[PDB]
Design a protein around this nucleic acid. Structure first.
Lengths: 85, 113, 200, 94
RNA sequence: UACUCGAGUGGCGAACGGGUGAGUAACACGUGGGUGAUCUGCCCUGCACUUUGGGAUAAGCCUGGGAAACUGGGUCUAAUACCGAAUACACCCUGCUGGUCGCAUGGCCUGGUAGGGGAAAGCUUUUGCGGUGUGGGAUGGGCCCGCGGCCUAUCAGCUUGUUGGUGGGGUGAUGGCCUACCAAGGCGACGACGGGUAGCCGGCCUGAGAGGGUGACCGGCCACACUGGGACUGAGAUACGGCCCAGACUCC
């Protein structure tokens, strides 16, 4: 940290990492909730919260937190698991 | 961004440029895509020559000229052709042809005899 | 760099008169030195070497320059000896000497070096300039009236000029048609030995 | 003066893929076989024609090829490690 | 006052350009292909938009801790900073289903249909600049492969995620890349595994040529930034003048 703009970048990078970490952890928690629900085997709850988790995946990819293709992969795996079970 | 640039050539005192198409991130003497023309500012009419067809293609694709390249393009009328304000006007001032060696030969023969 | 030492000395050693009209060569035809009278064993390297010495010491060129000229001529499509002689005869100093304005090659060298000449309107003061086809060589005004140049130009009844050179006006104008061929160089000595030496 | 909303993609000739012909010498895996290729390369200096052999591991879904068969293959995207080849059709069986 | 502008918030840049050749015998490099297995800010060109709401904080003012580096608390303020929602139906998934081309997975017709869903931002009146989704270009890449270029068996066996299959995970992408189970395989005298050395090339020097030596300048790639690990931000990171940790050294 010798030059001015790069110090400012240190600060902004820390802020951005905090925000992205929060979003990623929220997505992770929702995915785990679905995974537990489906492994338990309640198709109703699985669908009602799969809709929610899919919205979260898309609107997390919309903020640039994760890549659109990764969001698509995750939705695909989620829906395939529910449909199969 | 893909841009139209100039690259230095020639010796120490006299620069001689190639009108070039390259990426903005490349170095000045770096790798090129297409050699489109040339520019010798070290001459009295400042020789300029350019491939009109390739210039028009690259401009249509989205290339961005640098300031000297834009000045050259305006001189040779290809910028004016691309946009359409006056039309393709040739403002080029061609090198004045030099009298032929054989013609001076015969004139000297006549004068001395 | 030029060579300043005595000239009849090298003609003495090399067995051929170079300037042409001196008396020292005739009154002393043998090679110089204490042991210039000694009988000398023959050698093909001696022959080929002395041949180059005659060529270079007649024209004034140095070894590096002459080697570069030889490489150029060997690169040329013609016979190497012919290309050699025509290249060394394309020099401005040689052309000036051949047109008669210089009583000798040293005269031509100095008179070109001090910028008394001009080819196609540009002040050329370098002796190793190579004259091309269709060149017009004139003199400048300051040198036109100077006493030695005037003497040489007014008394110029010596050795005839060749075909490709032509002096045409009383202002001492030079005009050239073509690069000479082996008949028109007509300098002494031989080219095959010159070529073989550098082929060694 | 209003144009189309959708611009069709540009037509490109689909790429040529390398083809291989060989003999099956290990049909002892699952869905994968091992096949060699022949070639005749002149020596870089001496010039004598030299044959060399290259072992290649292919993927056949159905396991239809026995050991010692003249087979054809084509290049494919990686299916695993060491597996860039596929069985198209068993050209000559033995 | 806002002409102007220190410090500050916010954008873009900082990954380019410049340096060195330590390491690396390797798809690192050269050449030629593939991607029906893939990403790409700014630039160009079409289409559709750019609606509505909300909380906070830097800076400032007051105060504390500290030798310093720096840092804690209160109060206060703005946005193209941040965060909700409406619409998009061109996009992403899931289900059903047609045609067509194949090079098998499969691709292409913005296929058709049903269900769920995915955004935006304003400033300036002056040659006026921007914002979002999406179709298409150009550019810059990623990954895989054939072939080519050192010495040494007084280095003969090596390998257990090692070789392959299935389900999951992961990635931009395929793939033991990772993981669980199952099978016992895979590489080796056309020199595996070891040891020594070395950045690679376009080129340079020599030679009649083949060949031998070499990689100074200039140019293209690759690797690295005191040593050794690691990730974050970002379109893009060996992140030289960025961050974290452990070391050796220098200084307060």
């Amino acid at each position: 940290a010798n030059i001015k703009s790069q110090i400012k970048r240190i600060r902004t990078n820390e802020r951005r990492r905090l925000r992205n970490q929060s979003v990623k952890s929220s997505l992770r928690t929702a995915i785990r909730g679905f995974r537990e629900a489906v492994d338990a085997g309640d198709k109703d709850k699985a669908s009602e919260l799969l809709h929610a988790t899919s919205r979260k995946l898309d609107k997390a990819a919309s903020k640039g937190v994760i890549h659109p293709n990764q969001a698509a992969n995750k939705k695909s795996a989620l829906a395939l698991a529910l449909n199969k079970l | 961004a893909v841009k139209i640039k100039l690259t230095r050539l020639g010796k120490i005192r006299n620069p001689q440029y190639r009108i070039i198409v390259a990426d903005a991130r490349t170095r000045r003497d770096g790798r090129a895509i297409e050699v489109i023309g040339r520019y010798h500012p070290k001459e009295e009419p400042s020789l300029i020559q350019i491939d009109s067809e390739r210039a028009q293609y690259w401009l249509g694709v989205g290339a961005q000229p640098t300031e000297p390249v834009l000045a050259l393009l305006k001189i040779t009328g290809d910028w004016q052709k691309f946009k359409g304000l006056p039309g393709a006007e040739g403002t080029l001032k061609v090198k004045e042809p030099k009298p032929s060696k054989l013609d001076l030969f015969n004139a000297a023969l006549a004068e001395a005899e | 760099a030029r060579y300043t030492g005595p000239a009849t000395r090298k003609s003495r050693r090399l067995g051929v008169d170079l300037v042409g009209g001196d008396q020292s060569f005739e009154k002393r035809p043998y090679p110089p030195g204490q042991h210039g009278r000694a009988r000398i064993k023959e050698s093909e390297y001696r022959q080929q070497l002395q041949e180059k010495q005659k060529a270079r010491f007649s024209y004034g060129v140095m070894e590096k320059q002459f080697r570069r000229y030889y490489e150029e001529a060997n690169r040329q499509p013609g016979k190497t000896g012919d290309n050699l002689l025509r290249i060394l005869e394309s020099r401005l100093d040689n052309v000036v000497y051949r047109a008669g304005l210089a009583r000798t090659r040293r005269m031509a060298r100095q008179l070109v070096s001090h910028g008394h000449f001009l080819v196609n309107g540009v002040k050329v003061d370098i002796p190793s300039y190579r004259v091309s086809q269709y060149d017009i060589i004139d003199v400048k005004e300051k040198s036109l009236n100077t006493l030695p140049f005037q003497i040489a130009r007014e008394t110029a009844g010596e050795r005839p000029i060749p075909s490709w050179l032509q002096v045409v006006g009383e202002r001492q104008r030079i005009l050239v048609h073509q690069l000479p061929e082996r008949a028109q160089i007509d300098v002494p000595l031989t080219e095959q030995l010159i070529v073989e030496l550098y082929s060694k | 003066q209003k144009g189309p909303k959708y611009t069709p993609a540009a037509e490109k000739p689909r790429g040529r893929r390398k083809t291989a012909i060989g003999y099956v010498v290990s049909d002892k895996m699952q869905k994968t076989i091992v096949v060699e290729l022949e070639d005749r390369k002149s020596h870089p200096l001496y010039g004598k024609i030299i044959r060399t052999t290259k072992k290649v591991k292919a993927h056949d879904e159905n396991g239809e090829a026995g050991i010692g068969d003249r087979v054809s293959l084509m290049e494919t995207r990686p299916l695993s490690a060491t597996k860039r080849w596929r069985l198209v059709e068993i050209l000559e069986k033995a």
